[PDB]
Every structure is written in C-alpha cells, then in structure tokens.
Design a protein around this ligand. Structure first.
Ligand SMILES: CO[C@@H]1[C@H](O)[C@@H](COP(=O)(O)OP(=O)(O)OP(=O)(O)O)O[C@H]1n1cnc2c(=O)[nH]c(N)nc21
Ligand SMILES: CO[C@@H]1[C@H](O)[C@@H](COP(=O)(O)OP(=O)(O)OP(=O)(O)O)O[C@H]1n1cnc2c(=O)[nH]c(N)nc21
Ligand SMILES: [Mg+2]
Ligand SMILES: [Mg+2]
Ligand SMILES: [Mg+2]
Ligand SMILES: [Mg+2]
Ligand SMILES: [Mg+2]
Ligand SMILES: [Mg+2]
Lengths: 538, 537
DNA sequence: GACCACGGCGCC
DNA sequence: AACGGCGCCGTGGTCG
DNA sequence: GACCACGGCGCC
DNA sequence: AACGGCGCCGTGGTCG
C-alpha cells in the first residue's frame, strides 16, 4: 500500500481543494499513485515542485492553482477527457467513477488511485477508436494546457467605469419602476413573472400569446410581449427594466468584485467536459455570456480592457456554423454564398426590418441569426410566423423555399438522421460522437426533438473541433511572441499582446485560424485590435 | 521599362547558366509589377532588394540565394498552381504553351510571364477550394522547406567511397574474367543484345520473358532469376550488373559532386515532377541510394553527419497500407496495425520459408513486390513466375487477398466508378489526377488506366501527409538548431547536434504521427546514427 | 559524329 | 505486353 | 428557514 | 409544448 513522498515518475495525482474555483481555492491535500501504491505529500503546496506534470482527474484545475502560485506544472493525461470522448454525457468524476469503476471520494490518495485505474480502464474501452484517440492526443490533452494558461492569466477590467455604470443603471431602474407602478395602478414585484402575469393579462387584460414550458401559465417572455411593445408603453418599460436589472445583477455589480488579489484580474473557468456537442463552457463567472448586443450591452464590453502597454486582439470566425454546414453537406449554393462574399445574416435582416445592409444594427443581425439558424435547425412554422409576424402558410412556404434553395442541406440532414437511426449516435468531421436516443420514438414530437439534437451536433461539434485545433496550434506561437490567450467564445478568440507586437499577433492568429483544415469552403476570420473588447470588434 | 529596384509584391524572373541552382551562375534578374519590367544591372546584388522570390521556379532562385549567404524565401509560384490544377503541368515551357504566354530565355520576359500566369492560373482555380488550401497550406510553404534542404546538402565519407571504388573495380575484373572463361570468348557484359545471343543462342538457355517494345528475349533479373542456381554464369552476370551499376551511378560520381562552398553533396527536390503528388529528386537522385543488398548497405554508410552531429532517420511504417486502410475503411486491414503485425514480414516468411527474425532486407523488398503487386493489379501469369507456383494457384492467391480484404475491393470499384464519371481521381485532400482511357475499348489499355487511377489516391494521400509533416516540422527544427536533409517519400533524414539528437527525434516522431485523424494510427520508425545505415538499424 | 529510344535497374 | 510512381546508366541503330 | 424547479434571459 | 448548445438570476411552493 503506502510509501513516502515523492512518488516515482509517471505517477497519477489526486488532490482536494477548499472549493470549485482553482484560482480562489486552497489546496488542502495532494497525493500520487503508481502501480497501486499511494504516496501522500505532507506539505501539499511544496510537493507540487516534485511533479513534472499533473496527470489525473481534473488535471487542469490543479495546474491552474499551480500557475497562481508561480509554478509551471502543465496538465497531462486526464481520464475525464477519455471519458468525455467515449461519451460526452460523461461530465463529472463522480459520474465517470460510478459508470465505469471505483468511487470519487474526498480524499487525495483515493482520488490518485482512482485516476490511475480509470485511466487504463477508459483507455482500454477506447481501443479501436482511433479517431477518438487522435482527438485525445492531438486536441483535448494539449488543449487542457492551453486552458490552464487562459484561466490563470485572466482579463483586466475597468473597475471605475463599471462602478459609474452601476450608479447610472440604478437610477434608470428606479425611474422605470415608478413609471410602471404609475401605469398599473399599484406597486408590485416587476421581477416576479407570476405577478407580471396577473397584472398584464388579468388587470390590464392584454392578449396572452404564449404558454410557459412546464407550468402551463401565460408567458411574460420577450417572445410573448414583442408584438405588444409599440401599442402599450407599460410593456416597453418592463422589458427595459428586465434588461437593466439582468445586466446589473449578473455583470455590472458582481464582476468588478471578482478582481483577484494575486493578479489584479478577473478569472473564469473553461470547462472542458461540460457539453453534449464538444464545445467548451465557461463558468464562475461565465465570460462566454458577456452582453454585446444592446446599447447597454456594448458599454459592458467597454469594461474589458488590456494591461497598460497592451492591446486586445479579437478574432471571430465569420458565419462559422454555416461554412461548416456547407462543407458537411457539399451544398454548392451554400458554398457559393461565401465565394461571392455574401452574408445571409445581413440579407435576412435587411428583408426583416426593411432597411439597407449598412443600416443593419447588431440587434437586427442577432434577430436574423435566430431566423436563419431557426429554420435550418427545425423551428416550426407556428413559431416562425410569430417571429416574422406573417401568416402560418407563408411561414410554411418560407421553410420550404430555404430547403429548395439548399437541396443538399436537406439531403445531408436525411443522411445524418438515417445513419444516426442505425448507429444510435452522430459524429463530427473528426469523429467526435454524441449518442442520441429517441430517433425512432413513437411519439412524433419526442422523435422530432431527438432529430433536431442529432443533426445539429455534427455542425456545432465540427466547429468546436476546428476552434480547438486552432487554439492548440496557435497557443505555443503566441508565447514565443510575448502574447497571451485570454478568452474563447466558441467561434471567437480574444488575445492580449504588447501594443508593439499586436499587428503581427493579429496576422499570425488569422493565418493559423483560417488554415486549420482543407474544407470545401474557405474559413474567414474577422480581426480587430483595440484597448477594450468593444473597440477590438469595431 | 522602369529602373531597379521594383515596387513591393513584384514577380521575379531570372536566368541561370544551368539547371542545378547550387552549381549555377546567375546571368540575369528582373522583376515585374502592373506590366512594368524592372531589369537589375547587377543580378547577385539585386537579390538583396527583394523580400522574397515570387514567380516561376521561385525555389531555384531561393536556393542560389542561400548558397550566396542570403535568406530570400520563395513565395508564390504559378508552377505550383498549375501542378495542382493538373499534375501533367511539370515545366514552365509547357504551362506557358498550355495556358498563355511564352517561356523565353530573357529574365524580364520571364518576370512578366510569372505575373500573368499567376493571375491566369489563380483565376482558373477559382472555386477549387481544396486545391487552393493545398497551395496555401502545403505547397507554397513547402517550397521554402525544400529550398533549405537543397542548399544545406549532406556530408559524404569521401575516403570510404574511394576505397570502395577500388574494391569493387577488382571484383568487376574478376567476374568479367570468370564470365569470359565460362562463355568461351570475350564480349560486352553491359550489352543486353550480346548477352541475349550468348545466353540463349550459344549456351541455349531457356528464354522466359520478352522485352517491352523491341520484342527480344529479355536478360532482366526477372527472366534470369530461376536460372541462377543451376548455371554459375547467370549468377556471375547478375553480380557484375550490380557492381557496375553501383560503381557508375553512385560510388564514383557522388564523391566528385562535393561542393566548394559547403563541402557537401547537394540534390534537387523537384516539386512539380510526378503524376501523384510525390516529390522527385535529381542531379543526383538522393531518393535512389542503394540500401537493399550487402554492397548497397555499404554505400549508405558513406552518408554521414557533420562532426559533432548525428543523423535522425524517420520512415513511416507500412505507410501506403495504412493509407489504404483509412481510404477503404477495411477493418481487417485496420486490425493488422492494431495488432502490431507486419504483412511484409508475414509474406517474406512464407515466401522464403524462414522465421520472422531471419527475414533479410532483400527478402522484405521481395515481399513488398508481392504485397503491393497483387493489390495494384499484377497478373496471375507474372505472380506465378515471381512466386514459382502454377497459374491457377496464383489466381487463387489474388482472390484470397481480396476475400480477406473485401472493403479494399469495394474501394477500388468505387474509385474507378467515380473516376469513370469525372475523368479524374483524387487524394484525401483533393489533389487530383486526370486519367483518360478508363472506358477504353481495348481491355489491356483500360485495365492499365485503372491501375494508374486507383493507385494514385493512395500514393498521393501518403505524399500529401508527408508534405504536411514537413511544413509543420521544419520551423520547429530551426528553433532547435537542427536541419532537414532528405525526404525519400515516406522517410525524412534530419541532422542535429549530438546533444539535441534525442529531443529532435522525439519531436519529429510526434509531428509525423499526429498529422491527420486517420482511422489507422501512423507509426514512425526512428533511428539515430553517425551515418545513414546505422541510423536505421 | 551526334542523338536518343531503349533495356535494365537503383529507390519508394 | 503490363502492380504503381520516379531518375540514371551504357548500348547501338539511324541519320544528315 | 433551506432547498431547488422554474421562467426568464445573457452569449454562441 | 418544442431551432440547437450553455450558465446565472430572482421567485415562491413545498417540506420537515
Ligand atoms: C451552429 O452555428 C451557429 C453559428 O454560426 C455559431 C457562431 O455564432 P455567431 O458567431 O453569433 O454566428 P455567426 O458566426 O454565424 O455570425 P457572425 O460571427 O456574426 O458572422 O453559433 C451557432 N449559433 C449561434 N446562435 C445560434 C442560434 O440561435 N441557434 C443555433 N441553432 N445555433 C446558433
Ligand atoms: C503505395 O505504397 C507503397 C509503400 O507503402 C510506400 C513506401 O515504401 P516503403 O517504405 O518501401 O514500404 P513500406 O513503408 O510499406 O514498408 P517499410 O517502411 O519497410 O515498413 O511506397 C509504395 N511502394 C514501395 N514499393 C512499391 C512497389 O513495389 N509497388 C507499389 N505499387 N508501391 C510501392
Ligand atoms: Mg461568428
Ligand atoms: Mg461569434
Ligand atoms: Mg516505409
Ligand atoms: Mg520507406
Ligand atoms: Mg525508360
Ligand atoms: Mg432552465
């Protein structure tokens, strides 16, 4: 059983943190295991120096803590990544242990032994799965090291700007509350959907257009209230109240309070085994959800700034998911869109709002994305008629004209579903896999739902795979140039570079991101440089 | 005609005293932009004014520049665009004739042609997004890699080769005498005509095969293999041929090609010379160095590292068969690799009737000819001669292979069916070869076309993967003070300081095996050594 | 005397 | 003729 | 008083 | 109910 620190080479580590967030956490305990022997370390933080890498469950999290402490301990093998690739419903160590063998305890030494066993166990289960193993070796494992740096680096925040914005927004919220009290007759909680329901539909008697998902009540969502906006001033004021209160409580007030003592920066987590499609997620806080669409949203992006002497470089794949679809489907009308430098989000927005291309504002573009992606990924005619404010039959027709325009897209969806029906899974271009049950369910609505999940995944997942390969390829070249990778927002990368090197960093990042794979459609990257995140995308 | 220097993004043209850039004199240099030709009065000094060589045969000029101590990387080259459009485009003369303009012997004209052919061929490649990706991400950056490789060269053990020439000369004389004695009279052993008359008329030996085009009785190793053990003269002639071949082609000429500026041997890596997407090597051909026979192994010993350095040799294991397993999805073939089997060894063992460990390189090579032969459509007739078995048993051998690997057969059929409809076949990355005669009326002409067509995606995919490995590996070698010397299709030869050689080997292995998500893992055999033989032991 | 199609064979 | 893809050597028939 | 399913909504 | 994929906020019904 037990031997003394330090462990031999190629040992698997286990550890306990005071809490989830590695940047904020205390390292309570550290152990390592090889050939079944558990070596416990009496001084956890100092014992980090003895390891060449962190190999084991949640390796990246430990590596992040190490970086915080000034130690470069890269993450290596992690059974969670093997498990996530085997089945992306594997998202936690508790779950993976339960499903495949052993138990996730709260003791470093047990965790270290589990890491070792689960590693060989999951490796064994992945035998013959050569494309999943390639993703492991060439994408997921090296990416974990990229994510560790990203987490430990963080992003600078303009604190004073945000404090001033809180005060400004508070004042607007008070004014809107009063104006809505006046308009309704009486005080109430504007943040209570139950009380808003009773006020809007009972007392004021306004038409109740939609239902809620699970409670079957009349909905107060922006969807259900959109048509009612211009007629009734109260509805406008409530939606404005909602936006301001959302942005204040979720972003404006909490974020400046999360500045970290050791760095003077804001730190997030990039969760590498959290989605069914192969995307990353971000949490604590979610820096993949920063507002950007509305006028107030744009002011929040202004608060994300570079270190003094540096600039932000923002690179966002243009119409990423649609380019990926063009490749997957081979639809040459869709391939043609890109070869001609057309933008279908702009084209749809122009039609929708009845304005030229140049007068398409970000709200409009986002609203057009919802139609373009909506129709493609199986939005009903009913919902599309409400969203475009057109008759049912004309919505039905709209849907059929899209697939008439893009017949190889339709054929691709059908092939994807037919295969998914026989195999029980769908997969990305690199062979990442998602199990989708219910493709042959008897209830139509449950089958059709399963279908939408299934033919979406290869597109969303292929795009994620391509971004991850870009990151793994780009990151080592950034370090050589004294540049940093701060954020990923799915099809977007945010970097930080010295003002001197920012032009060259932009050019290299663009090249790497656009040359990742021989697609039937060229990948194009929108680059911007700026002192803050808003101006870096102007 | 405006004055030197030219504006930025100009296309260059140049004239060399000769083919080989390492040996050539730069007679003239010009550059062109927007139709204006800027002629340089001092060619060699005018190289300093360019940021890159853009234009026809850009790599060749870049090599001359490197020789001169100037780092002028090659960029755009219409030859590469043309080669990707159709790999029958191999020369500037041909490309100009086919697509527009004329290849002259005047720098300024060549520079203007470069500009016009660039936009012309770019235009013709519109919509061909995978070919353009190969251009931007593989062929263009590779041209820079090849420039360094050419200008770096490889060290040669000159004294060793001189001693070997003397030793081989003596053997040649002895064998000639022993063959004169055995035949009755002198004659030219190097004359196939006189060997024919001596072997088949005078000595009356059976004449098993014909020559391709002259319809005479063949004196080839094929036609003489069965006759070896019975008749001592036939053995002696084959040995004579090997020694004279190796002496005249490698042993004597190579040490005389050591270059005054480097003290090394330099080759050319021709980037638009093959129908499949492979490189070729010429002047001399360092992709043809003997390896197989005992004497062949001694020649490899002559390829050595600089003092204080080691050679690193990396060769894709059963690379073409791994590529086929991916293309075909044949899971029996995928299984071979997952189990760490070697079908070349397996075939050789049964052919020669010896264990795995007693398979010598001659035997392995002979097994490769059977394994690849049968796959790529060798007739039963020829296979019966090569295995020395009855016709019917050769027929059966062929059918058992495709019974074992049914998705390979299905893959061949799909490849041919599509090639029939499109008139071309293509690699995994979309590199394309036009193959006429897939529907020819004469069976033999059709079948030939077929063999060319279903071979290409395999040979070409393998070439594409190697080129991507080179483009990815090369920049990382420079950071480590290492060099890339040679490519031999599925093989890379590097040179590194003895201290860094372990780390260079490990990085090169990683890069070469992680190039693409195949259904079969790519495995690289690595070796380190002072010479090329020992780096592969 | 100059040229080059050809057999033969080195490598993958 | 016909496994596929290259490049290099020495021979001797042909021609102006 | 503690918990958490839920509507709603920020982003891709 | 049903475009797909996430994570975060404040509300109020339920329960021991
Ligand atoms: C499946 O691909 C799409 C998008 O292409 C991808 C990236 O989002 P974003 O960058 O906002 O859209 P896109 O890149 O197409 O537009 P621009 O970056 O503005 O050119 O994210 C996916 N996505 C974004 N919003 C939605 C959405 O509402 N529905 C679905 N089904 N997918 C969406
Ligand atoms: C189409 O692929 C094959 C081979 O896989 C490839 C590489 O050659 P080499 O490295 O000698 O063979 P391989 O890599 O299969 O074996 P080892 O490296 O010895 O493991 O080169 C091709 N090749 C080699 N010799 C031949 C041959 O005689 N015929 C054909 N048709 N192809 C051949
Ligand atoms: Mg985008
Ligand atoms: Mg985006
Ligand atoms: Mg090989
Ligand atoms: Mg080889
Ligand atoms: Mg020939
Ligand atoms: Mg929810």
């Amino acid at each position: 059983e037990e031997a003394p620190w330090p462990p031999p080479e190629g040992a698997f580590v286990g550890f306990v943190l005071s809490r989830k967030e590695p940047m904020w956490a205390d390292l309570l305990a550290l152990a390592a295991a090889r050939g079944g022997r558990v070596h416990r370390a009496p001084e956890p933080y100092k014992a980090l120096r003895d390891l060449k890498e962190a190999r084991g469950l949640l390796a990246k999290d430990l590596s992040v803590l190490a970086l915080r402490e000034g130690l470069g301990l890269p993450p290596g093998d992690d059974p969670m990544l093997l498990a996530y690739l085997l089945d992306p419903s594997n998202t936690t160590p508790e779950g993976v242990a339960r499903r495949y063998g052993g138990e996730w305890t709260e003791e470093a030494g047990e965790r270290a032994a589990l890491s070792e066993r689960l590693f060989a166990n999951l490796w064994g289960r992945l035998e013959g799965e050569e494309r999943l193993l390639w993703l492991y070796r060439e994408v997921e494992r090296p990416l974990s090291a990229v994510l560790a740096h990203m987490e430990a680096t963080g992003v600078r925040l303009d604190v004073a700007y945000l404090r001033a914005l809180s005060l400004e927004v508070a004042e607007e919220i008070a004014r809107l509350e009063a104006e809505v009290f006046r308009l309704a007759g009486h005080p109430f909680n504007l943040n209570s959907r139950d009380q808003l329901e009773r006020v809007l539909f009972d007392e004021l008697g306004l038409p109740a257009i939609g239902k809620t998902e699970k409670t079957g009540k009349r909905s107060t969502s922006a969807a259900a209230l959109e048509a009612l906006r211009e007629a009734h001033p109260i509805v406008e004021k409530i939606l404005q109240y909602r936006e301001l209160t959302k942005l204040k409580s979720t972003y404006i007030d909490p974020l400046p309070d999360l500045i970290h003592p050791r760095t003077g920066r804001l730190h997030t987590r990039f969760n590498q085994t959290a989605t069914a499609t192969g995307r990353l997620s971000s949490s604590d806080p979610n820096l993949q959800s920063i507002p950007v669409r509305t006028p107030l949203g744009q002011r929040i992006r202004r608060a994300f700034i570079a270190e003094e002497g540096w600039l932000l470089v923002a690179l966002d794949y243009s119409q990423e998911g649609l380019r990926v679809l063009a490749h997957l489907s081979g639809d040459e009308n869709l391939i043609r869109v890109f070869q001609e430098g057309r933008d279908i989000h702009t084209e749809t927005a122009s039609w929708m709002f009845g304005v030229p291309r140049e007068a398409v504002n970000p709200l409009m573009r986002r609203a057009a994305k919802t139609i373009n992606f909506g129709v493609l990924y199986g939005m009903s005619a009913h919902r599309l008629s409400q969203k475009l404010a057109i008759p049912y039959e004309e919505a039905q027709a709209f849907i059929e004209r899209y697939f008439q325009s893009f017949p190889k897209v339709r054929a691709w969806i059908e092939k994807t579903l037919e295969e998914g029906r026989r195999r029980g899974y769908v997969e990305t271009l690199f062979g990442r896999r998602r199990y989708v049950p219910d493709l042959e369910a008897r209830v139509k609505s449950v089958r059709q739902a399963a279908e939408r999940r299934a033919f979406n995944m290869p597109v969303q997942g292929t795009a994620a795979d391509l971004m991850k390969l870009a990151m793994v390829k780009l990151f080592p070249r950034l370090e050589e140039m004294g540049a940093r990778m701060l954020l990923q927002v799915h099809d977007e990368l945010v970097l930080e570079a010295p003002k001197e090197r920012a032009e060259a960093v932009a050019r290299l990042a663009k090249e790497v991101m656009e040359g990742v794979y021989p697609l039937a459609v060229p990948l194009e990257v929108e680059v911007g440089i700026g002192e803050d995140w808003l101006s870096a995308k102007e």
